[PDB]
């Protein structure tokens, strides 16, 4: 299922959640137009990767999540894996994010 | 140096 984090505090129980499922994680800024219209294919993903946890991530709400890992420019995805970071990249492209799903799957 | 398909920081928000 999607879940928002608006706390550093919360992304730790989110990873500990996710436990050994992958985990995507989206520091798209809600304020900006150009990264929140790009959320439908990361959100829509949610249920063609069920078996995979996406986290939603503000970085205007949720800067303390976004300030730890000193992102330099939205919108980044990250992947976390039993709490792990295996890979992160940048740019508005949302099919990206199927492929690294698939090379983390 | 500004690119629509990234959101830079430098913005007050």
Redesign the interface.
């Not at chain 1, 939603?56 to 894996?81: I, M, N």
């Given at each position: 299922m999607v879940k928002q984090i608006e706390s550093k505090t919360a992304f730790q129980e989110a990873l500990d959640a996710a436990g050994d499922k992958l985990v995507v994680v989206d520091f798209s800024a809600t304020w900006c137009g150009p990264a929140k219209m790009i959320k439908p294919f990361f959100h829509s993903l949610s249920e063609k990767y069920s078996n995979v946890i996406f986290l939603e991530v503000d970085v205007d709400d949720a800067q303390d999540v976004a300030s730890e890992a000193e992102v330099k420019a939205t919108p980044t995805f990250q992947f976390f894996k039993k709490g792990q970071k295996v890979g992160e990249f940048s740019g508005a492209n949302k099919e990206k994010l199927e492929a690294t799903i698939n090379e983390l799957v | 140096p500004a690119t629509?398909?990234?959101?830079?920081?430098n913005?007050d928000?």
């Amino acid at each position: 299922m999607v879940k928002q984090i608006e706390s550093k505090t919360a992304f730790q129980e989110a990873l500990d959640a996710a436990g050994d499922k992958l985990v995507v994680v989206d520091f798209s800024a809600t304020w900006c137009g150009p990264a929140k219209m790009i959320k439908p294919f990361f959100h829509s993903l949610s249920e063609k990767y069920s078996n995979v946890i996406f986290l939603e991530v503000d970085v205007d709400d949720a800067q303390d999540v976004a300030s730890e890992a000193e992102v330099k420019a939205t919108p980044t995805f990250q992947f976390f894996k039993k709490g792990q970071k295996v890979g992160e990249f940048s740019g508005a492209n949302k099919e990206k994010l199927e492929a690294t799903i698939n090379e983390l799957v | 140096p500004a690119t629509l398909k990234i959101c830079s920081w430098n913005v007050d928000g």
